[PDB]
Amino acid sequence: STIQIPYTITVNGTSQNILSSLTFNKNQNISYKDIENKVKSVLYFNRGISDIDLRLSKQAEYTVHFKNGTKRVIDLKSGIYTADLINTSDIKAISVNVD
Numbered sequence: 001s002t003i004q005i006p007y008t009i010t011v012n013g014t015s016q017n018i019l020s021s022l023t024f025n026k027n028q029n030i031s032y033k034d035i036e037n038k039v040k041s042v043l044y045f046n047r048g049i050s051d052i053d054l055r056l057s058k059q060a061e062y063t064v065h066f067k068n069g070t071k072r073v074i075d076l077k078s079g080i081y082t083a084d085l086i087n088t089s090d091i092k093a094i095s096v097n098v099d
């Protein structure tokens, strides 16, 4: 009843094509706040980037890449106010960039 959604994290750059993914429930509507929590978890455990490191970064975002070719960029240092939910099975991949 779960699926993997691939993700990548850019902090200072790697020379690798890392095949990492996050576990989500299949075909479930979720919020951008839910995704933000999962992004924060992998930032900490994979890269040692804590919430305080995000507070002290000049810019940070994650981007949801949809299967239809469109994207939504979420600013990790700003509030999330949309009520829109998105379906996990419509998501192709998630990218994260922290400065």
Ligand code: NA
Pocket: 008, 009, 010, 011, 013, 014
């Ligand atoms: Na990278």
Ligand code: NA
Pocket: 075, 078
């Ligand atoms: Na913003």
